[PDB]
Amino acid sequence: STGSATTTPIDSLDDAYITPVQIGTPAQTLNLDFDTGSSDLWVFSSETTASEVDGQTIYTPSKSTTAKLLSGATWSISYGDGSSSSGDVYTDTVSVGGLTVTGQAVESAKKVSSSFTEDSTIDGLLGLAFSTLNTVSPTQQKTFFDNAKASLDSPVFTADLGYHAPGTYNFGFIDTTAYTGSITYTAVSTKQGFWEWTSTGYAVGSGTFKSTSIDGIADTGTTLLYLPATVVSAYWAQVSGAKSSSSVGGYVFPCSATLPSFTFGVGSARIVIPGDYIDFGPISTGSSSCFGGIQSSAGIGINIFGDVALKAAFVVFNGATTPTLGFASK
Ligand SMILES: CC(C)(C)S(=O)(=O)N[C@@H](Cc1ccccc1)C(=O)N[C@@H](Cc1c[nH]c[nH+]1)C(=O)N[C@@H](CC1CCCCC1)C(O)(O)C(F)(F)C(=O)NCCN1CCOCC1
């Protein structure tokens, strides 16, 4: 089997991408953020504290004939940006783009943090990291991909995110029309539960490529590209007037600037991020100071190849016995 679904930016800046997901019988369609940085499939629900719901579409398990409460199971997660959610667990039928999993763990939120309430466009998350990170207690649950994998034509999914435009998530096949050149594959470490790999280096604009190992994760649920302070300083030094702002909490630049591209290495191959992908707009409405899309990872502890980087590539998440990651230009 296979599946294919379109993913859409939630706003004009590509802060995040949402993908429609069918849950239950009859189907309830929710727009979820596909997140290769976590391993929980959770949704706004009829059980969510009503004052914490403000415009989201909710899952009502009582209206699904295939939903079953998973007795005694609960979940609770905290994300890198400080947001969080928690609740109880159902098993139900879940379909993505024509690919169906029966008996998927659907984590129903009883509580969400203010940042979730305040964002009406994201109805929940679909985690695509390794199932060792799943937070359900006392019996850890498998991800959508792990459940689907043996049925798939090939044990893979691909991410093809758009710049200021929709893109595609595919399951079980590689669309050879969706990229240029060849796919370069690179090793993955699963020891931390992530799609962790090592980039071979970087270049700024038309500059010389610097060969250096940069360990990081491929993370569709993070907006920005977080890299070592040395690399980040080298980038923003090429932008007149850019600076690290204490009050904003990262690099800002004049909205009148033209930004250089950023290149990262995948083995002997190279992925080029155009400069406009690195512009996230005014820091506050009406400001002439704009937020940068490349930021330091120093306060985070790991480098993160978030959407700014991934949307420049066609990315293969190969879930074979020994996982690998593939990157192609497009
Ligand atoms: C505005 C922004 C300054 C650019 S922001 O950073 O707030 N944007 C958010 C994404 C966003 C956009 C729009 C609306 C809502 C949220 C962002 O990029 N958040 C990252 C920031 C980050 C990364 N690393 C450190 N900080 C994040 O937490 N991403 C997680 C998923 C997000 C959470 C908020 C809602 C959207 C999905 C994440 O899963 O990718 C993760 F990998 F960082 C993460 O937290 N992984 C959790 C892993 N735990 C390990 C222990 O076992 C349980 C699993």
Side-chain angles (χ1 to χ4, degrees):
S1 65
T2 64
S4 178
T6 298
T7 191
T8 302
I10 67 167
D11 67 17
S12 67
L13 301 174
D14 300 343
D15 281 313
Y17 300 79
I18 51 173
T19 311
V21 179
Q22 279 70 227
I23 311 177
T25 310
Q28 300 177 42
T29 300
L30 274 66
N31 300 151
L32 310 184
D33 189 344
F34 283 25
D35 180 17
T36 58
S38 70
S39 304
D40 288 52
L41 192 177
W42 76 260
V43 297
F44 276 78
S45 64
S46 52
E47 309 176 331
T48 305
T49 295
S51 64
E52 289 175 7
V53 183
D54 190 8
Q56 298 81 13
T57 292
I58 64 172
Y59 173 54
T60 305
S62 67
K63 292 203 263 166
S64 173
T65 55
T66 41
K68 299 131 200 150
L69 186 66
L70 186 63
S71 189
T74 59
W75 63 280
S76 177
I77 190 163
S78 300
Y79 294 102
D81 59 20
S83 69
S84 60
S85 52
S86 59
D88 59 6
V89 187
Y90 292 84
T91 58
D92 211 339
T93 300
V94 175
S95 296
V96 179
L99 171 67
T100 302
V101 170
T102 57
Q104 174 63 221
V106 179
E107 300 173 38
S108 163
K110 292 187 123 211
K111 292 172 185 155
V112 306
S113 63
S114 59
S115 57
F116 286 114
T117 297
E118 286 164 5
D119 177 20
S120 66
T121 68
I122 291 173
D123 301 324
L125 267 59
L126 192 148
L128 294 162
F130 295 89
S131 293
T132 52
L133 299 178
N134 183 83
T135 75
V136 175
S137 187
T139 307
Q140 277 198 119
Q141 305 297 123
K142 296 183 171 164
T143 66
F144 179 80
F145 177 57
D146 266 1
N147 296 300
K149 195 186 276 193
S151 299
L152 296 177
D153 289 2
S154 177
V156 309
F157 65 92
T158 65
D160 180 12
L161 299 182
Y163 169 67
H164 290 2
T168 304
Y169 281 102
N170 290 331
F171 293 84
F173 72 103
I174 292 162
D175 183 355
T176 58
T177 71
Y179 56 89
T180 61
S182 74
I183 307 176
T184 293
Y185 291 86
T186 193
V188 167
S189 178
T190 59
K191 296 307 228 140
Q192 288 184 278
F194 301 117
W195 294 90
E196 186 169 2
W197 64 289
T198 299
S199 172
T200 51
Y202 69 99
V204 179
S206 59
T208 179
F209 190 85
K210 178 89 182 139
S211 289
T212 181
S213 294
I214 306 168
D215 191 294
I217 65 166
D219 191 2
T220 58
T222 292
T223 312
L224 311 179
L225 172 57
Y226 293 91
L227 289 174
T230 48
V231 176
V232 176
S233 181
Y235 180 84
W236 294 107
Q238 300 302 310
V239 180
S240 291
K243 69 176 197 265
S244 188
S245 176
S246 201
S247 72
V248 170
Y251 283 90
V252 298
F253 70 94
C255 292
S256 63
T258 294
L259 300 180
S261 65
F262 187 87
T263 298
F264 64 92
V266 182
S268 63
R270 306 287 176 255
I271 302 296
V272 181
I273 306 171
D276 287 346
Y277 291 25
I278 297 157
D279 182 351
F280 283 82
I283 61 175
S284 285
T285 302
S287 190
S288 69
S289 294
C290 280
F291 197 67
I294 297 176
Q295 297 294 344
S296 179
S297 68
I300 293 166
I302 195 133
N303 309 112
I304 306 178
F305 292 88
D307 297 339
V308 161
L310 302 179
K311 73 181 82 167
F314 176 88
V315 187
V316 183
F317 293 84
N318 173 6
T321 300
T322 299
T324 65
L325 267 175
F327 296 82
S329 292
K330 71 192 178 187

PDB file of all heavy atoms in Angstrom, residues 10 15-16 33 35 37-38 77-81 83 116 119 122 125 133 135 194 219 221-224 226 300 304, ligand 1:
ATOM      1  N   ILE A  10       0.216  27.297   7.523  1.00  0.00           N
ATOM      2  CA  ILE A  10      -0.858  27.847   8.341  1.00  0.00           C
ATOM      3  C   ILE A  10      -0.975  29.374   8.217  1.00  0.00           C
ATOM      4  O   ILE A  10      -1.964  29.958   8.588  1.00  0.00           O
ATOM      5  CB  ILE A  10      -0.678  27.493   9.832  1.00  0.00           C
ATOM      6  CG1 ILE A  10       0.532  28.150  10.487  1.00  0.00           C
ATOM      7  CG2 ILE A  10      -0.658  25.966  10.007  1.00  0.00           C
ATOM      8  CD1 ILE A  10       0.527  28.065  11.989  1.00  0.00           C
ATOM      9  N   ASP A  15       5.026  29.355   9.120  1.00  0.00           N
ATOM     10  CA  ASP A  15       5.418  29.060  10.508  1.00  0.00           C
ATOM     11  C   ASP A  15       5.292  27.578  10.797  1.00  0.00           C
ATOM     12  O   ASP A  15       6.054  27.024  11.620  1.00  0.00           O
ATOM     13  CB  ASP A  15       4.611  29.916  11.508  1.00  0.00           C
ATOM     14  CG  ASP A  15       5.147  31.332  11.611  1.00  0.00           C
ATOM     15  OD1 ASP A  15       6.367  31.520  11.743  1.00  0.00           O
ATOM     16  OD2 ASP A  15       4.379  32.340  11.560  1.00  0.00           O
ATOM     17  N   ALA A  16       4.335  26.902  10.174  1.00  0.00           N
ATOM     18  CA  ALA A  16       4.046  25.494  10.347  1.00  0.00           C
ATOM     19  C   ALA A  16       3.187  25.031   9.170  1.00  0.00           C
ATOM     20  O   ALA A  16       2.640  25.882   8.446  1.00  0.00           O
ATOM     21  CB  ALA A  16       3.374  25.185  11.683  1.00  0.00           C
ATOM     22  N   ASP A  33      -0.292  18.810  12.527  1.00  0.00           N
ATOM     23  CA  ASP A  33       1.096  19.155  12.230  1.00  0.00           C
ATOM     24  C   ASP A  33       1.941  17.895  12.263  1.00  0.00           C
ATOM     25  O   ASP A  33       2.120  17.293  13.334  1.00  0.00           O
ATOM     26  CB  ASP A  33       1.566  20.220  13.246  1.00  0.00           C
ATOM     27  CG  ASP A  33       2.889  20.883  13.022  1.00  0.00           C
ATOM     28  OD1 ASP A  33       3.649  20.322  12.217  1.00  0.00           O
ATOM     29  OD2 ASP A  33       3.129  21.937  13.689  1.00  0.00           O
ATOM     30  N   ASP A  35       5.156  15.934  12.533  1.00  0.00           N
ATOM     31  CA  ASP A  35       6.295  16.332  13.332  1.00  0.00           C
ATOM     32  C   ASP A  35       7.303  15.187  13.433  1.00  0.00           C
ATOM     33  O   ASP A  35       7.135  14.280  14.231  1.00  0.00           O
ATOM     34  CB  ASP A  35       5.834  16.740  14.732  1.00  0.00           C
ATOM     35  CG  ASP A  35       6.928  17.184  15.682  1.00  0.00           C
ATOM     36  OD1 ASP A  35       8.018  17.488  15.154  1.00  0.00           O
ATOM     37  OD2 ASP A  35       6.685  17.192  16.918  1.00  0.00           O
ATOM     38  N   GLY A  37      10.007  15.292  14.851  1.00  0.00           N
ATOM     39  CA  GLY A  37      10.665  15.483  16.117  1.00  0.00           C
ATOM     40  C   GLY A  37       9.984  14.923  17.338  1.00  0.00           C
ATOM     41  O   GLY A  37      10.446  15.068  18.468  1.00  0.00           O
ATOM     42  N   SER A  38       8.850  14.252  17.180  1.00  0.00           N
ATOM     43  CA  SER A  38       8.125  13.672  18.296  1.00  0.00           C
ATOM     44  C   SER A  38       7.340  12.454  17.795  1.00  0.00           C
ATOM     45  O   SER A  38       7.263  12.200  16.584  1.00  0.00           O
ATOM     46  CB  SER A  38       7.198  14.697  18.976  1.00  0.00           C
ATOM     47  OG  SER A  38       6.078  15.045  18.158  1.00  0.00           O
ATOM     48  N   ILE A  77       3.111  15.543  27.293  1.00  0.00           N
ATOM     49  CA  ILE A  77       4.313  15.919  26.565  1.00  0.00           C
ATOM     50  C   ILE A  77       4.586  17.405  26.720  1.00  0.00           C
ATOM     51  O   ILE A  77       3.667  18.222  26.840  1.00  0.00           O
ATOM     52  CB  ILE A  77       4.126  15.513  25.099  1.00  0.00           C
ATOM     53  CG1 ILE A  77       5.388  15.618  24.248  1.00  0.00           C
ATOM     54  CG2 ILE A  77       2.960  16.256  24.460  1.00  0.00           C
ATOM     55  CD1 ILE A  77       5.322  14.855  22.950  1.00  0.00           C
ATOM     56  N   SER A  78       5.860  17.771  26.694  1.00  0.00           N
ATOM     57  CA  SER A  78       6.385  19.108  26.702  1.00  0.00           C
ATOM     58  C   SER A  78       7.371  19.263  25.548  1.00  0.00           C
ATOM     59  O   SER A  78       8.222  18.402  25.372  1.00  0.00           O
ATOM     60  CB  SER A  78       7.151  19.366  28.001  1.00  0.00           C
ATOM     61  OG  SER A  78       6.333  19.219  29.140  1.00  0.00           O
ATOM     62  N   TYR A  79       7.165  20.337  24.816  1.00  0.00           N
ATOM     63  CA  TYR A  79       7.942  20.577  23.605  1.00  0.00           C
ATOM     64  C   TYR A  79       9.056  21.575  23.862  1.00  0.00           C
ATOM     65  O   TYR A  79       9.067  22.286  24.853  1.00  0.00           O
ATOM     66  CB  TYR A  79       6.985  21.019  22.489  1.00  0.00           C
ATOM     67  CG  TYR A  79       6.015  19.952  22.073  1.00  0.00           C
ATOM     68  CD1 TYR A  79       4.689  19.990  22.512  1.00  0.00           C
ATOM     69  CD2 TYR A  79       6.353  18.859  21.274  1.00  0.00           C
ATOM     70  CE1 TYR A  79       3.744  19.037  22.158  1.00  0.00           C
ATOM     71  CE2 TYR A  79       5.437  17.870  20.919  1.00  0.00           C
ATOM     72  CZ  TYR A  79       4.138  17.976  21.359  1.00  0.00           C
ATOM     73  OH  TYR A  79       3.209  17.028  21.003  1.00  0.00           O
ATOM     74  N   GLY A  80       9.995  21.613  22.917  1.00  0.00           N
ATOM     75  CA  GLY A  80      11.129  22.506  22.949  1.00  0.00           C
ATOM     76  C   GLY A  80      10.836  23.955  23.183  1.00  0.00           C
ATOM     77  O   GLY A  80      11.624  24.661  23.841  1.00  0.00           O
ATOM     78  N   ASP A  81       9.720  24.445  22.667  1.00  0.00           N
ATOM     79  CA  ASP A  81       9.340  25.854  22.805  1.00  0.00           C
ATOM     80  C   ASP A  81       8.550  26.131  24.076  1.00  0.00           C
ATOM     81  O   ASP A  81       8.070  27.247  24.264  1.00  0.00           O
ATOM     82  CB  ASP A  81       8.559  26.323  21.584  1.00  0.00           C
ATOM     83  CG  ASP A  81       7.297  25.539  21.342  1.00  0.00           C
ATOM     84  OD1 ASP A  81       6.809  24.883  22.296  1.00  0.00           O
ATOM     85  OD2 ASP A  81       6.815  25.595  20.173  1.00  0.00           O
ATOM     86  N   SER A  83       5.726  24.716  25.099  1.00  0.00           N
ATOM     87  CA  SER A  83       4.309  24.319  25.058  1.00  0.00           C
ATOM     88  C   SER A  83       4.124  22.891  25.543  1.00  0.00           C
ATOM     89  O   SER A  83       5.073  22.106  25.671  1.00  0.00           O
ATOM     90  CB  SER A  83       3.807  24.538  23.640  1.00  0.00           C
ATOM     91  OG  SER A  83       4.365  23.646  22.713  1.00  0.00           O
ATOM     92  N   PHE A 116      -1.211  26.613  22.317  1.00  0.00           N
ATOM     93  CA  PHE A 116      -2.081  25.765  21.484  1.00  0.00           C
ATOM     94  C   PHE A 116      -3.460  26.400  21.377  1.00  0.00           C
ATOM     95  O   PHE A 116      -3.998  26.504  20.285  1.00  0.00           O
ATOM     96  CB  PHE A 116      -2.145  24.341  22.020  1.00  0.00           C
ATOM     97  CG  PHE A 116      -0.886  23.516  21.758  1.00  0.00           C
ATOM     98  CD1 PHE A 116      -0.068  23.087  22.777  1.00  0.00           C
ATOM     99  CD2 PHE A 116      -0.524  23.159  20.478  1.00  0.00           C
ATOM    100  CE1 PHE A 116       1.090  22.337  22.512  1.00  0.00           C
ATOM    101  CE2 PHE A 116       0.601  22.411  20.184  1.00  0.00           C
ATOM    102  CZ  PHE A 116       1.437  22.008  21.213  1.00  0.00           C
ATOM    103  N   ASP A 119      -3.745  29.281  18.861  1.00  0.00           N
ATOM    104  CA  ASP A 119      -3.545  28.961  17.449  1.00  0.00           C
ATOM    105  C   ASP A 119      -4.708  28.088  16.941  1.00  0.00           C
ATOM    106  O   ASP A 119      -4.738  26.885  17.127  1.00  0.00           O
ATOM    107  CB  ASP A 119      -2.217  28.254  17.224  1.00  0.00           C
ATOM    108  CG  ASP A 119      -2.021  27.836  15.777  1.00  0.00           C
ATOM    109  OD1 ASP A 119      -2.703  28.409  14.895  1.00  0.00           O
ATOM    110  OD2 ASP A 119      -1.160  26.941  15.569  1.00  0.00           O
ATOM    111  N   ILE A 122      -4.133  24.710  14.108  1.00  0.00           N
ATOM    112  CA  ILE A 122      -3.530  23.381  14.351  1.00  0.00           C
ATOM    113  C   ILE A 122      -4.435  22.627  15.307  1.00  0.00           C
ATOM    114  O   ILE A 122      -4.622  23.074  16.432  1.00  0.00           O
ATOM    115  CB  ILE A 122      -2.093  23.519  14.854  1.00  0.00           C
ATOM    116  CG1 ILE A 122      -1.159  24.056  13.761  1.00  0.00           C
ATOM    117  CG2 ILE A 122      -1.524  22.212  15.373  1.00  0.00           C
ATOM    118  CD1 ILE A 122       0.246  24.368  14.239  1.00  0.00           C
ATOM    119  N   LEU A 125      -1.152  17.059  16.564  1.00  0.00           N
ATOM    120  CA  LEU A 125       0.151  16.675  16.017  1.00  0.00           C
ATOM    121  C   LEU A 125       0.103  15.216  15.588  1.00  0.00           C
ATOM    122  O   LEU A 125      -0.601  14.388  16.188  1.00  0.00           O
ATOM    123  CB  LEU A 125       1.299  16.797  17.031  1.00  0.00           C
ATOM    124  CG  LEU A 125       2.080  18.114  17.060  1.00  0.00           C
ATOM    125  CD1 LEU A 125       1.152  19.277  17.353  1.00  0.00           C
ATOM    126  CD2 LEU A 125       3.197  18.209  18.086  1.00  0.00           C
ATOM    127  N   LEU A 133      10.201   7.317  21.633  1.00  0.00           N
ATOM    128  CA  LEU A 133       9.875   8.595  22.276  1.00  0.00           C
ATOM    129  C   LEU A 133       8.384   8.746  22.623  1.00  0.00           C
ATOM    130  O   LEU A 133       8.002   9.766  23.179  1.00  0.00           O
ATOM    131  CB  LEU A 133      10.254   9.793  21.423  1.00  0.00           C
ATOM    132  CG  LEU A 133      11.743   9.902  21.097  1.00  0.00           C
ATOM    133  CD1 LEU A 133      11.945  11.129  20.186  1.00  0.00           C
ATOM    134  CD2 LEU A 133      12.584   9.939  22.353  1.00  0.00           C
ATOM    135  N   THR A 135       4.993   8.995  24.480  1.00  0.00           N
ATOM    136  CA  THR A 135       4.809   9.286  25.901  1.00  0.00           C
ATOM    137  C   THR A 135       3.688   8.533  26.604  1.00  0.00           C
ATOM    138  O   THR A 135       3.468   8.700  27.803  1.00  0.00           O
ATOM    139  CB  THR A 135       4.585  10.783  26.252  1.00  0.00           C
ATOM    140  OG1 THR A 135       3.273  11.205  25.898  1.00  0.00           O
ATOM    141  CG2 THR A 135       5.617  11.672  25.576  1.00  0.00           C
ATOM    142  N   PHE A 194      15.430  10.292  17.446  1.00  0.00           N
ATOM    143  CA  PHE A 194      15.213  11.230  16.364  1.00  0.00           C
ATOM    144  C   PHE A 194      15.846  10.726  15.071  1.00  0.00           C
ATOM    145  O   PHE A 194      16.684   9.814  15.037  1.00  0.00           O
ATOM    146  CB  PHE A 194      15.878  12.574  16.734  1.00  0.00           C
ATOM    147  CG  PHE A 194      15.390  13.231  17.997  1.00  0.00           C
ATOM    148  CD1 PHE A 194      16.244  13.419  19.046  1.00  0.00           C
ATOM    149  CD2 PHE A 194      14.104  13.697  18.109  1.00  0.00           C
ATOM    150  CE1 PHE A 194      15.759  13.961  20.223  1.00  0.00           C
ATOM    151  CE2 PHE A 194      13.666  14.301  19.253  1.00  0.00           C
ATOM    152  CZ  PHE A 194      14.466  14.420  20.367  1.00  0.00           C
ATOM    153  N   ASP A 219      13.760  17.806  11.412  1.00  0.00           N
ATOM    154  CA  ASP A 219      12.603  18.122  12.236  1.00  0.00           C
ATOM    155  C   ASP A 219      11.538  18.942  11.500  1.00  0.00           C
ATOM    156  O   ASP A 219      11.561  20.167  11.473  1.00  0.00           O
ATOM    157  CB  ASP A 219      12.995  18.689  13.581  1.00  0.00           C
ATOM    158  CG  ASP A 219      11.795  18.746  14.499  1.00  0.00           C
ATOM    159  OD1 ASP A 219      10.705  18.322  14.092  1.00  0.00           O
ATOM    160  OD2 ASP A 219      12.036  19.241  15.620  1.00  0.00           O
ATOM    161  N   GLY A 221       8.594  19.583  12.450  1.00  0.00           N
ATOM    162  CA  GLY A 221       7.754  20.356  13.343  1.00  0.00           C
ATOM    163  C   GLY A 221       8.421  21.540  13.963  1.00  0.00           C
ATOM    164  O   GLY A 221       7.867  22.192  14.900  1.00  0.00           O
ATOM    165  N   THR A 222       9.596  21.915  13.534  1.00  0.00           N
ATOM    166  CA  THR A 222      10.308  23.136  13.939  1.00  0.00           C
ATOM    167  C   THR A 222      10.417  24.081  12.744  1.00  0.00           C
ATOM    168  O   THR A 222      10.774  23.658  11.639  1.00  0.00           O
ATOM    169  CB  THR A 222      11.712  22.787  14.488  1.00  0.00           C
ATOM    170  OG1 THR A 222      11.575  22.083  15.753  1.00  0.00           O
ATOM    171  CG2 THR A 222      12.546  24.003  14.780  1.00  0.00           C
ATOM    172  N   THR A 223      10.080  25.338  12.948  1.00  0.00           N
ATOM    173  CA  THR A 223      10.029  26.315  11.855  1.00  0.00           C
ATOM    174  C   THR A 223      11.428  26.612  11.306  1.00  0.00           C
ATOM    175  O   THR A 223      11.632  26.656  10.075  1.00  0.00           O
ATOM    176  CB  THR A 223       9.416  27.648  12.326  1.00  0.00           C
ATOM    177  OG1 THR A 223       8.210  27.485  13.058  1.00  0.00           O
ATOM    178  CG2 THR A 223       9.158  28.567  11.121  1.00  0.00           C
ATOM    179  N   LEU A 224      12.378  26.916  12.179  1.00  0.00           N
ATOM    180  CA  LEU A 224      13.666  27.519  11.849  1.00  0.00           C
ATOM    181  C   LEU A 224      14.801  26.498  11.726  1.00  0.00           C
ATOM    182  O   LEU A 224      14.681  25.304  12.020  1.00  0.00           O
ATOM    183  CB  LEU A 224      14.050  28.585  12.910  1.00  0.00           C
ATOM    184  CG  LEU A 224      12.954  29.592  13.231  1.00  0.00           C
ATOM    185  CD1 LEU A 224      13.464  30.556  14.299  1.00  0.00           C
ATOM    186  CD2 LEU A 224      12.447  30.377  12.016  1.00  0.00           C
ATOM    187  N   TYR A 226      18.344  25.798  13.250  1.00  0.00           N
ATOM    188  CA  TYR A 226      19.147  26.095  14.421  1.00  0.00           C
ATOM    189  C   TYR A 226      20.534  25.407  14.292  1.00  0.00           C
ATOM    190  O   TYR A 226      20.604  24.159  14.199  1.00  0.00           O
ATOM    191  CB  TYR A 226      18.458  25.625  15.681  1.00  0.00           C
ATOM    192  CG  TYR A 226      17.182  26.368  16.031  1.00  0.00           C
ATOM    193  CD1 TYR A 226      15.954  25.906  15.560  1.00  0.00           C
ATOM    194  CD2 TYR A 226      17.178  27.511  16.826  1.00  0.00           C
ATOM    195  CE1 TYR A 226      14.807  26.574  15.870  1.00  0.00           C
ATOM    196  CE2 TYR A 226      15.996  28.187  17.143  1.00  0.00           C
ATOM    197  CZ  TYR A 226      14.814  27.691  16.654  1.00  0.00           C
ATOM    198  OH  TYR A 226      13.626  28.333  16.939  1.00  0.00           O
ATOM    199  N   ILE A 300      19.864  25.282  23.035  1.00  0.00           N
ATOM    200  CA  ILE A 300      19.020  24.126  22.788  1.00  0.00           C
ATOM    201  C   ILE A 300      19.709  22.799  23.032  1.00  0.00           C
ATOM    202  O   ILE A 300      19.093  21.823  23.460  1.00  0.00           O
ATOM    203  CB  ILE A 300      18.580  24.023  21.317  1.00  0.00           C
ATOM    204  CG1 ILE A 300      17.650  25.140  20.870  1.00  0.00           C
ATOM    205  CG2 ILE A 300      17.948  22.656  21.034  1.00  0.00           C
ATOM    206  CD1 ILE A 300      17.550  25.142  19.356  1.00  0.00           C
ATOM    207  N   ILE A 304      19.177  21.681  14.794  1.00  0.00           N
ATOM    208  CA  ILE A 304      17.867  21.313  14.230  1.00  0.00           C
ATOM    209  C   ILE A 304      17.717  21.814  12.801  1.00  0.00           C
ATOM    210  O   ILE A 304      17.691  23.011  12.565  1.00  0.00           O
ATOM    211  CB  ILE A 304      16.714  21.813  15.083  1.00  0.00           C
ATOM    212  CG1 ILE A 304      16.818  21.358  16.543  1.00  0.00           C
ATOM    213  CG2 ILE A 304      15.400  21.369  14.459  1.00  0.00           C
ATOM    214  CD1 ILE A 304      15.703  21.885  17.411  1.00  0.00           C
TER     215      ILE A 304
HETATM  216  C1  LIG B   1       7.522  31.313  16.247  1.00  0.00           C
HETATM  217  C2  LIG B   1       8.779  30.390  16.392  1.00  0.00           C
HETATM  218  C3  LIG B   1       9.792  31.391  17.157  1.00  0.00           C
HETATM  219  C4  LIG B   1       9.532  30.247  15.061  1.00  0.00           C
HETATM  220  S1  LIG B   1       8.558  28.974  17.547  1.00  0.00           S
HETATM  221  O1  LIG B   1       9.818  28.214  17.778  1.00  0.00           O
HETATM  222  O2  LIG B   1       7.565  29.140  18.646  1.00  0.00           O
HETATM  223  N1  LIG B   1       7.589  27.955  16.169  1.00  0.00           N
HETATM  224  C5  LIG B   1       7.422  26.699  16.740  1.00  0.00           C
HETATM  225  C6  LIG B   1       6.450  25.843  15.798  1.00  0.00           C
HETATM  226  C7  LIG B   1       5.100  26.581  15.769  1.00  0.00           C
HETATM  227  C8  LIG B   1       4.699  27.343  14.704  1.00  0.00           C
HETATM  228  C9  LIG B   1       3.409  27.876  14.609  1.00  0.00           C
HETATM  229  C10 LIG B   1       2.434  27.629  15.608  1.00  0.00           C
HETATM  230  C11 LIG B   1       2.836  26.820  16.678  1.00  0.00           C
HETATM  231  C12 LIG B   1       4.151  26.345  16.761  1.00  0.00           C
HETATM  232  C13 LIG B   1       8.646  25.785  16.880  1.00  0.00           C
HETATM  233  O3  LIG B   1       9.432  25.749  15.915  1.00  0.00           O
HETATM  234  N2  LIG B   1       8.761  24.985  17.928  1.00  0.00           N
HETATM  235  C14 LIG B   1       9.874  24.034  18.053  1.00  0.00           C
HETATM  236  C15 LIG B   1      10.941  24.848  18.763  1.00  0.00           C
HETATM  237  C16 LIG B   1      12.073  24.053  19.238  1.00  0.00           C
HETATM  238  C17 LIG B   1      12.671  23.008  18.636  1.00  0.00           C
HETATM  239  N3  LIG B   1      13.671  22.622  19.487  1.00  0.00           N
HETATM  240  C18 LIG B   1      13.693  23.427  20.538  1.00  0.00           C
HETATM  241  N4  LIG B   1      12.736  24.317  20.411  1.00  0.00           N
HETATM  242  C19 LIG B   1       9.322  22.799  18.741  1.00  0.00           C
HETATM  243  O4  LIG B   1       9.146  22.798  19.971  1.00  0.00           O
HETATM  244  N5  LIG B   1       8.981  21.780  17.939  1.00  0.00           N
HETATM  245  C20 LIG B   1       8.362  20.523  18.438  1.00  0.00           C
HETATM  246  C21 LIG B   1       7.006  20.354  17.738  1.00  0.00           C
HETATM  247  C22 LIG B   1       6.061  21.583  17.719  1.00  0.00           C
HETATM  248  C23 LIG B   1       5.617  21.946  19.104  1.00  0.00           C
HETATM  249  C24 LIG B   1       4.668  23.154  19.064  1.00  0.00           C
HETATM  250  C25 LIG B   1       3.496  22.900  18.102  1.00  0.00           C
HETATM  251  C26 LIG B   1       3.979  22.508  16.705  1.00  0.00           C
HETATM  252  C27 LIG B   1       4.961  21.312  16.843  1.00  0.00           C
HETATM  253  C28 LIG B   1       9.203  19.253  18.143  1.00  0.00           C
HETATM  254  O5  LIG B   1       8.509  18.044  18.398  1.00  0.00           O
HETATM  255  O6  LIG B   1       9.620  19.245  16.753  1.00  0.00           O
HETATM  256  C29 LIG B   1      10.484  19.045  18.942  1.00  0.00           C
HETATM  257  F1  LIG B   1      11.272  18.176  18.289  1.00  0.00           F
HETATM  258  F2  LIG B   1      11.239  20.108  19.088  1.00  0.00           F
HETATM  259  C30 LIG B   1      10.162  18.485  20.342  1.00  0.00           C
HETATM  260  O7  LIG B   1       9.867  19.262  21.241  1.00  0.00           O
HETATM  261  N6  LIG B   1      10.413  17.187  20.416  1.00  0.00           N
HETATM  262  C31 LIG B   1       9.907  16.575  21.644  1.00  0.00           C
HETATM  263  C32 LIG B   1      10.702  15.339  21.981  1.00  0.00           C
HETATM  264  N7  LIG B   1      10.307  14.780  23.267  1.00  0.00           N
HETATM  265  C33 LIG B   1      11.491  14.024  23.800  1.00  0.00           C
HETATM  266  C34 LIG B   1      11.119  13.317  25.017  1.00  0.00           C
HETATM  267  O8  LIG B   1      10.156  12.313  24.616  1.00  0.00           O
HETATM  268  C35 LIG B   1       8.970  13.003  24.187  1.00  0.00           C
HETATM  269  C36 LIG B   1       9.328  13.708  22.961  1.00  0.00           C
END
